[PDB]
Amino acid sequence: VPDPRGIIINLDEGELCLNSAQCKSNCCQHDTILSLSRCALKARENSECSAFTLYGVYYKCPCERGLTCEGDKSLVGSITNTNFGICHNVGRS
């Protein structure tokens, strides 16, 4: 009720962003480690996600409401600061 974060504004996927607070769907999508951050789509079943949302730019955007990220490492990028996984409809266990 008293100000719960409130920083996400109004941009589409496919436009240049600084943090994840720029786009309507809060997914500012990074290259792998250095920079190049443009907004993208949130993941669905059988797609490569990172894990969940923090407050910042994402190497591979997380799974939508209902699906979980299954952390198999998945090195589609060479060098990063995360673990990548496949989106599935199971809810952690």
From Swiss-Prot:
Compartmental location: Secreted
Propeptide: 1-5
Main location class: secreted
Cellular-component GO terms for this entry: extracellular region
Gene Ontology biological-process entries: digestion; lipid catabolic process; response to bacterium; response to food; retinoid metabolic process
Disulfide links within the chain: 17-28, 23-39, 27-61, 49-69, 63-87
Tissue spec. comment: Expressed by the pancreas.
Similarity-based family: Belongs to the colipase family.
Function statement: Colipase is a cofactor of pancreatic lipase. It allows the lipase to anchor itself to the lipid-water interface. Without colipase the enzyme is washed off by bile salts, which have an inhibitory effect on the lipase.
Subunit structure as annotated in this protein's UniProt entry: Forms a 1:1 stoichiometric complex with pancreatic lipase.
Protein's recorded name: Colipase
Source organism of the structure: Sus scrofa (Pig)
Gene name linked to the record: CLPS
